[model samples]
Target: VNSFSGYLKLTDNVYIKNADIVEEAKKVKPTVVVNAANVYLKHGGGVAGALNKATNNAMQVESDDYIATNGPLKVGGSCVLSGHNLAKHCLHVVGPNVNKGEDIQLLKSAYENFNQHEVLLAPLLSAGIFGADPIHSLRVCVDTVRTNVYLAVFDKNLYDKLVSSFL
Candidate 1:
């Protein structure tokens, strides 16, 4: 799983690296491989682009089921639930807004449903800047799901904090 800015550049280097990662995962003989990422509708078309083309092709060629997520509830009419079963069933959970206690309920429901055989994916809860702050979003999601989450953006600084808090 990977998290990135929704508007990040889709350079050749990024594509090459993504392809390489898929190739590597093919050798693992895994039944289900998830390509989690933080994607949005505008700019790079976020998860939609990566899933429909890049990751989907890889998963199809390797015969491995795949799953991914963009983010919480509706974002400009694009709902995460729409991505479900594009290549495989994608579970989309509606998490709480920043600092809201609703996340606790949502996380509990997710834990009860998500199993080893299923792919439970979500985008960065509060990773949007200038609108919603990443720190607050991360705090709510981390507090709720802890280590169970597969964060798209792998920040060294945040990683240490998350690991210490959960693991």
Candidate 2:
């Protein structure tokens, strides 16, 4: 199985990695793979893009189905769907767009929204296009996620900051 380097022990159960979320997630086959999604749940690019391609676009189909049924998810809300080729479930979470306002509560809720029982493979939510500071996102993630999780970080600079902050 393929994996990346720089796995840091955030806690006993939680870990941080400067790696591709989908690749490492595929290795562990967690119960849920969390996507940092827009309000409409469109799997266009970034982590969503990779996940959609990895799951053969089935993730987008389910995402569309979810929105069609429930309408667009509000900021900080989560929608869980079948993971298809990846994990057992795909948790699509809409986080605060920092361009609008830096509501750390909204960002924290994105981490809070998911069920803790399932093994989670989650990204640093809202830190990408959403514009939240990666370090702040890391703080909220580590604070909120109690269950075992692989907190995959794709950006090298973000990874470095997180490692330094945690150390």
Candidate 3:
């Protein structure tokens, strides 16, 4: 592990970590890594860039295949894909491009887009958990932050179980 995790409790079973998403994710053995991605599932730039590299470049293939078969995130909404053996999946929320100069406001609201919120939920369904949400999704906008960029990772069935307990 290459980080010092600061835990942020969300309800009972969910935790947002101020650690490296991929680094922390790997800690629990190959995990279903969640990525907050765009509609095109572009993993070549921004946070996706680091994320893709960490996944050994399989992240882009996952997105590319989805777009090819599903047609650009069909709902033009959100989706997630991972490999049990694949190490993880992604939450493609069909929005939020990289920051574009002085007014990068579009990036912040990406979190508020409720329709896209489902992105966080997907990581849990694919034999995984969001690991964490909110902060991890917020990582793309930051610069020079290697670890502890406010990301979360969940514990598989435990996360799902904790979620149910949350209610």
lDDT of each: 0.33, 0.80, 0.43
What is the per-residue lDDT of model 3 for residues 54-137, given as tens digits with 9 covering 90 to 100?
778777886788789877642224565773332444444433333312123343344333333222222221111212332333
Of the candidates numbered 2 and 3, which has the greater TM-score value?
2
Number of backbone collisions per candidate: 4, 0, 13
C-alpha lDDT of candidate 3 relative to the true structure = 0.43
Q: Each model's TM-score, in the order given?
A: 0.35, 0.88, 0.49
Residue 32 Cα positional deviation in candidate 1, in Å, after optimal superposition: 9.2
- Give the per-residue lDDT of model 2 (tens digit) for 1-167: 22324577778667888888888777767778888888888888888889899989888888888888889988988887887878888888888878767576898788887555446778988877788888888778778877777788887776888888774
Off by over 4 Å in 1: 1-44, 55-87, 92-119, 126-131, 145-147, 154-167
True-vs-predicted CA distance for residue 61, candidate 3, Å: 1.7
- Clash number for candidate 3: 13
lDDT of 1 by residue, 131-161 (tens): 3444444455444443333344435565445
Best by lDDT: 2
Q: Is candidate 1 or candidate 2 better by lDDT?
A: 2
**What residue runs in model 3 are displaced by over 4 Å at the alpha carbon?**
1-6, 10-14, 29-32, 74-76, 83-88, 98-167
